[PDB]
Amino acid sequence: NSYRAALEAGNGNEGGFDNKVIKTERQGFWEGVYRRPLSQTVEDLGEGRGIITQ
Amino acid sequence: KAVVPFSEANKKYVSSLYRKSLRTAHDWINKTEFYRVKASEIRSRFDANKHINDPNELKVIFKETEALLEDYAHPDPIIPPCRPGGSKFERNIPPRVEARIPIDV
Amino acid sequence: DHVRSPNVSFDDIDYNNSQDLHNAQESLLREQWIRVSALKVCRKALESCYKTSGPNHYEDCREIAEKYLNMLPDHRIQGFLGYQKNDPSK
Amino acid sequence: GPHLLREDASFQRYGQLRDNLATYWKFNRKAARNVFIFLVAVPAGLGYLAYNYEGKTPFVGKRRTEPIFEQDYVPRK
Amino acid sequence: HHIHTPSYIKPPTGGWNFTPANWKQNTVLVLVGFTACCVGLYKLGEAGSYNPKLKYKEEELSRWNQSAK
Amino acid sequence: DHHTPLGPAE
Amino acid sequence: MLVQNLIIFNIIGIVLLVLLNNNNNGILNKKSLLTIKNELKLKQIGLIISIINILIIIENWIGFNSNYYGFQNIERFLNIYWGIDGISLLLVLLTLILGPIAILSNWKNLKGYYTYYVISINMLVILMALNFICLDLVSFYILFESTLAPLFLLIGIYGANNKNKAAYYVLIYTLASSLFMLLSIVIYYIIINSTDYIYINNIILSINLQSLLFIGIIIGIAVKTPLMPVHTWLPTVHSESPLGGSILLAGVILKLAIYGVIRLLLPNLSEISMMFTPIIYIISILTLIYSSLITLKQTDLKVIIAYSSISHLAVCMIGIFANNLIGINGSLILCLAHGFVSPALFILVGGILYDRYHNRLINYYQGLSTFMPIFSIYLVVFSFCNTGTPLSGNFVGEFLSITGAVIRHPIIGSLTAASVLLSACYQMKLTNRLTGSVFSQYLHITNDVTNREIFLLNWLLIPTIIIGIYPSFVTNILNLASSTLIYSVLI
Amino acid sequence: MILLCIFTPFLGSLISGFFGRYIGVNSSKWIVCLSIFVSVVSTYILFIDVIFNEIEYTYNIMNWLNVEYLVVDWSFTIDKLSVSMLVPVVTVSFLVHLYSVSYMSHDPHQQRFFSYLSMFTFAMIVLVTGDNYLILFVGWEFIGVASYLLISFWFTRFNAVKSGLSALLINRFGDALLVLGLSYLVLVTGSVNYNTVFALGSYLDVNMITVILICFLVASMAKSAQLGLHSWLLLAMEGPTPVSSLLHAACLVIAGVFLLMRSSPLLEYTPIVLLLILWLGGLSTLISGLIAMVSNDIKKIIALSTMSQVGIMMIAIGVSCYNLALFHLICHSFFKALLFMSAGSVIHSIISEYQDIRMYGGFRQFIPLAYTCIFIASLSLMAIPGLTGFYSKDIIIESMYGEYTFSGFIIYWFALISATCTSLYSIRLIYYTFLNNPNSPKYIYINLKENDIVLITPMIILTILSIFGGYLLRDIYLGMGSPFNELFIHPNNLSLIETEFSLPSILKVLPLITGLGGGLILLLIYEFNYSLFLVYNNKNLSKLYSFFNQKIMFDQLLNNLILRSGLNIGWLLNVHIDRGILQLFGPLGLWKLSTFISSKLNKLVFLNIGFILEIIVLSWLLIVFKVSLLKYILLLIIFIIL
Ligand SMILES: CCCCCCCCCCCCCCCCCC(=O)OC[C@H](COP(=O)(O)OCCN)OC(=O)CCCCCCCCCCCCCCCCC
Ligand SMILES: CCCCCCCCCCCC(=O)OC[C@H](COP(=O)(O)OCC[N+](C)(C)C)OC(=O)CCCCCCCCCCC
Ligand SMILES: CCCCCCCCCCCC(=O)OC[C@H](COP(=O)(O)OCC[N+](C)(C)C)OC(=O)CCCCCCCCCCC
Ligand SMILES: CCCCCCCCCCCC(=O)OC[C@H](COP(=O)(O)OCC[N+](C)(C)C)OC(=O)CCCCCCCCCCC
């Protein structure tokens, strides 16, 4: 689970980031993205204080 | 402690119980004619037991006299305004007289 | 002078181009500040009516009061991090 | 300067003690009674209320959809 | 009587029945200031105030309620 | 009487 | 220009002061002219540099554009990219303004080595001023931790009776925690290969990895803006440090932790900041209520003001984590207003009384409004400002921060309103005791506030009431800068 | 005119405060009294132009807050209600300053006293003329700042210092709630303006109005000193007599009523809040009437009279008759200012300057002028027909019954007892000090005179208002259908018709019949049959007397229990947390641990071949054991530390 192992397995940020490529599944632990599916935000933050509704 | 009748210190205690008794009557009774009547009685109650030559007999009265005052204590005693507890106590105290010792800050 | 807003959307640009991404963030901020300015104007119209109507303020100021309570939740500054980093379509 | 303060020996002990209460403190059953209340009981109680209502209060511009006054009167007499 | 220590204690409000020797002169300098400012405050009050019941005619409001509809 | 005289010039 | 002029001139000034003082050391005893009047010439050159530092930033404030979104005045110096935006500009202005005031506060109340003190004060101010204008986490951390070296020596050399305990507290509390902030900075450099602000603002991390980095960074922040239960260093250090060290340690150092939220948590860790905001409110509301109650049982004069500092900073953190513009603008105005009122009280408590009677115990002081009236006017005036009286700049900060707290969370965020009542409990009790009853029988009549100490008070009160009456001076700079910190998707 | 009417007191307070040294004592007082008089005349001009001519004034200095949608101005307006409150405030305060020119003549600090007093008037003026709630909140706090400075004016007196603190801290309790109410006003409507918030009253959720207004009610309980937050009201008598007159007739003690009246458009859409005010405003009137009858200090009696009268306005608010509560507010400021002034005149005249009415007696002829002012004012207080307090207080008592609900019936008797006790503790006050057998020594009676003409003028002018003010102004406020939209009455809450037409014919006389008819009976006992009241013998009466003389033992409950527990929690936090668990998980605790660990490690460094050789050979075991056994070796190592 070290970043070195993830990088050596293609699960690191060696590949850059992009807004036109959205991944439906959740990204790996060490992976970063420019943009995220909103359903992942709601499934984490929950609706309420400024997410989706007011 | 022990109570020694006719000693100077024992008399002053009885003097103090007298100022507690009459002032407390004065606190409740707000007419002079009614106050003198009750104030006369208290002295009679104070002077009837004037003669005691025994320690232990006297100490019971001291125990009783404190109880009499505590139950009859006024919830708002009259106080002179400039005496401690009064309406004008500590008002406009003149400032202290002393020399200003300058400091080179 | 009066700078024109760079009307640009997060949905048409590449975030690798951090110059264009900056405009997409600056354009989404400026439009929101207009809505607050639009909101403060509408509220001014409500205030004149209530002061002028007096007893009739419930009638002569009916749709302004209705509209003001409708624009209030969404006519506020929300930033761009919400929409830059989230994808409503997904 | 000139020591413009009449230093007091008893105040110095009081000041010395009040700034050194850590030395004499013990973790007896009394302290745990207080420590549990302030570091756990209150934070958890408020922590539940904070998370329970976190997102359940859309009070911005809330509207009324239910009458306040009553229409018909039903006298006892 | 008692001593005010007035050699050094000089608060802005005097202290213990303070009255300067040239108090008659200073008051006229102060009575001007109250008069100078009260007159000055009257000018601004007239120039900068308004009636908030006559700025907009009801004929203008009646278009606002319908436009928002 | 009050007899408090005026203080210095200010 | 800016940073390059700000470092090169200060380094030149520091070298100049060292050359002048140490020339005569040699092998022979020296009675030179520069030692006369307690190093007065060397103190003056230190005071001028503090004033000149303000002139450098104003040269760049004129060019600032309030309608441009993004960092301005960007420059690269020492392979580090700098820059200014709306939020950073005002905090830089506060930091440099406290420069002359920190030096002026200690003009003639040190036993010696004034040149060392003057160099350290200008050094700490520059390090903190530069901390608002860097553009990467690594450089943020470098400036965030470099202030320990002078501050630890300054408190130890010039401190009060317990200076050794105070020195051992600031060095270890603010290093054993900021090292946890280094770990989260390092992890940013491992996965993203860069710690620049702009580059890392656009990246989203996994919600597990967001929680780790937040916990690391907020550990380093919860100590600098002391949040219970890790606040124990601040009351001790304040009661023992030199008076000038207290003005900087309260005026600026605490506000570096609120600025830590603005750069390190809200933009890049936006998703996990929403999750922690309920928890942050719990910690800050308990900090607000406990710090106010603990102050009611304190005896040292300079500790009592120290805890009042903790209650206000808890409110500042409450507002900044509110996800609206009202809370964020209110939190930043409160930090600026607290940046003047807090130093003013330490001057009143540890700088005017302590320089005359040399005792900080509250029991000796009462009835001070009799033979020290000018002192009691400012103590009364600053007591109200410290408690959010509507005409001061603190009320604007506190009202908005409370308003923003309720907007974010109506139920528990409403408990911020207890700040209005509790702040008046410990503070007004302290003022009412000091300026009440007869003059104390343990003190002796002495001078009232001197002309220098009036100058310090008037120029900490004047900025406070301008921001109160017309806070739009601060707001016109903040609005476009503070609007980039809000995370919300409405559909 | 508006800008002259508002800020004229302010520069008057500054001039006495900052130039009072350079113009001495005599001029400082008069220039201050001039500033209030300028605002009085300016106010009366606007009163004519606003109340009768239907005109409004609004001076907007500049912007205060401009945080996105939340925009607040330094805007000052004068509507009907703002000018309905500037008559009681500025008029009374001008006479108070005129009265206080002579009352304070024997006090060394008269530049500071007047500087505070005109500051107090300016804050209240800002309180009622602000066009939003924040401008109101600014004056709402400087009311407490000026009151704290006024109440503790004799800062050398220990009692006046702590009573000033008691007023500020309890008021800041409501101020905290008032701030919280404003935040929910921004949360719900994004505004604190009057033109905006009141225009949206019906459309808003009922729960939200309650959250806002409950906070307003709690804040108003602090300032108006109702039951629960009232312990400070009687502690306020430590200030000079002019302070009590201005602060208990035409200032903060009424500011609680104004906040509820101003927010009437919201208050009509949450009947639960109105119902609470009715009970708080009914219980408070009952209690302070009962407390006053067994109160001996003269200023305490009048101060308790203010709490009962101020609570009468609360039940008027509760039944949504804001026009009634407002009108009684004006009428109450007239005689209640006079009563404190007349109390100040009595105490000034008696050379011992006593305040216990148990040390007075037979004053009616030595000071006939002081007595008559109390007599005319008290009758106006007791609502004698044809006076001013009659035309304002009496209708409220009717409208408790005219509501024809359960709460109106229950409060009706609490209010009617308040009218009864008002007619009783007044008679007790007048007899004990003017008609009783003398209690002071003779040397006092031979040296009892009235006071100078400067002290006399303000009282007579307030007397005339207490005979004619209420009748003239009755139709302006209580008029059937007079346009006063500033006070908003929902159509289902109007009972002025049934209050005046449907009441039983015996109730319309019930307050007065028990008022004077019951007054004579008590007068005879105090005169002819005082032996009944020697209550110390009777334990039932002594317990009853002690309870009400100690003010429902509410003061003891606050201090002995609530305040001390609040300070104790500070102590427990300061003992078990700050110097307790945080030092154990901090400096002290880690020093203990490090002293233990380092004392073991020092014992290991010693030059010995046998020791170093044995350690090395043990470490060869780490090559033999399987790596999964490391943590057990980690635990075994930790054990041998112990
Ligand atoms: C506010 C937020 C929190 C901030 C602080 C967070 C960290 C705080 C950690 C607190 C834990 C220590 C505090 C409690 C220990 C206090 C020690 C003590 O009280 O004495 C117990 C005993 C010392 O012996 P004695 O002389 O008899 O003293 C008795 C006095 N009651 O001591 C002993 O007998 C020893 C106890 C067992 C020792 C086991 C050793 C295990 C290894 C040590 C832990 C290492 C921790 C660091 C690990 C990495 C280090 C590189
Ligand atoms: C809306 C904003 C309004 C601001 C207008 C300010 C007018 C009042 C100025 C008072 C100056 C003065 O004189 O205070 C100082 C007075 C002077 O005492 P003295 O009577 O001169 O006697 C002198 C002899 N002593 C001093 C022995 C009695 O003593 C004090 O130290 C009193 C304690 C501090 C009072 C603080 C009041 C500050 C006002 C509130 C600020 C918000
Ligand atoms: C902006 C960053 C620039 C870098 C500055 C580097 C500091 C080196 C200065 C050496 C000059 C010197 O040794 O001189 C000594 C000078 C002045 O002593 P004095 O009182 O005049 O002499 C005293 C003896 N007498 C009076 C008898 C003659 O005091 C100083 O050193 C103060 C500044 C350094 C203190 C903290 C150092 C921490 C370093 C780590 C920081 C991250
Ligand atoms: C996650 C929260 C992080 C917060 C910061 C870290 C804790 C702060 C500790 C303060 C230290 C202090 O106080 O240092 C000074 C202290 C002692 O105190 P003293 O000044 O000598 O007086 C008190 C002395 N008596 C008893 C004689 C009066 O020295 C020590 O005990 C030395 C050992 C401390 C080791 C610190 C390890 C830090 C590890 C942190 C991760 C668990």
Side-chain angles (χ1 to χ4, degrees), chain G residues 169 229 231 293-294 297-298 307 326 369 384 387 391 395 403 407 410 414 417 420-421 424 432 437 468-471, chain H residues 63-64 69 74 134 137 141-142 145 148 155 161 165 169 172-173 176 183-184 567 570-571 574 578-579 582 587:
Chain G
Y169 280 12
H231 73 256
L293 291 172
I294 296 180
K297 313 302 294 192
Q298 301 301 336
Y307 273 98
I326 294 182
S369 52
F384 295 146
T387 65
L391 279 186
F395 164 80
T403 304
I407 294 189
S414 306
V420 185
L421 161 74
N432 191 32
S437 165
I469 289 197
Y470 202 80
Chain H
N63 198 91
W64 191 12
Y69 57 86
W74 283 108
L134 264 170
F137 185 84
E141 294 277 17
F142 283 93
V145 168
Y148 153 84
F155 57 77
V161 147
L165 186 73
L169 298 192
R172 289 284 270 179
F173 189 87
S183 305
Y184 270 82
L567 282 170
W571 175 250
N574 185 77
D578 209 310
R579 334 258 178 171
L582 291 199

Side-chain angles (χ1 to χ4, degrees), chain H residues 75-89:
Chain H
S75 176
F76 293 89
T77 187
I78 293 198
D79 57 18
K80 282 193 176 188
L81 177 48
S82 278
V83 81
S84 297
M85 296 294 301
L86 283 188
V87 173
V89 165

Side-chain angles (χ1 to χ4, degrees), chain G residues 473-487:
Chain G
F473 296 148
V474 180
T475 285
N476 284 331
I477 292 172
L478 293 180
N479 273 348
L480 189 48
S482 306
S483 39
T484 77
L485 296 178
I486 295 190
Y487 186 95

